[PDB]
């Protein structure tokens, strides 16, 4: 099977503005999680047909990635800053229900996600 489409990054029928926390979610927040050693697997949608995976898109059917989270934010995608950290928590999510615990990938997640919450605790008002 190939993949699915990706999950929309604009569209023209939602309304769209910029907030203080929204240029820290992706000036800070995306910019730290996106250099960091174990980013690579999360920079783009699962490739299942790549990576074959091929139940991936059978168990995993909000999929969301940091590919997308980056395109979203500065199309100006987001409304409110929830929206975003919505996003992130279902990418890691997505990560941990698929695969076990111990496998590399949770770990890599797991990583960025203790760097993700660390970040979040200092957005701005
Ligand atoms: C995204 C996503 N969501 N589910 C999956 C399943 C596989 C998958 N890929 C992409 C990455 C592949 C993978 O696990 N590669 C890891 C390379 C091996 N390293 C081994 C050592 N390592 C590591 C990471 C965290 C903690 C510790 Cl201790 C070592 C870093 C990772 C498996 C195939 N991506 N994925």
Redesign the pocket.
């Known amino acids: 099977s190939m993949n699915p489409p990706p999950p929309e990054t604009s569209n023209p029928n939602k309304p769209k503005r910029q907030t203080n926390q929204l240029q820290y979610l992706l000036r800070v927040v995306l910019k730290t999680l996106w250099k960091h050693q ?1 980013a690579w ?2 920079q783009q949608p ?1 490739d299942a047909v790549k ?1 074959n ?1 091929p139940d ?1 898109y059978k168990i995993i059917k909000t999929p969301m990635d940091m590919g997308t989270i980056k395109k979203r934010l500065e199309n100006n995608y987001y409304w409110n800053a929830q929206e975003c950290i919505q996003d992130f928590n279902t990418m890691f999510t ?2 941990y229900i ?2 076990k615990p111990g ?3 949770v ?2 997640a797991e ?1 960025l996600e203790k760097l993700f919450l660390q970040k979040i605790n200092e957005l701005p008002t």
């Open positions: 174990f697997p999360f699962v990576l995976l991936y997505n990560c698929y695969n496998d590399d990938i770990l890599m990583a």
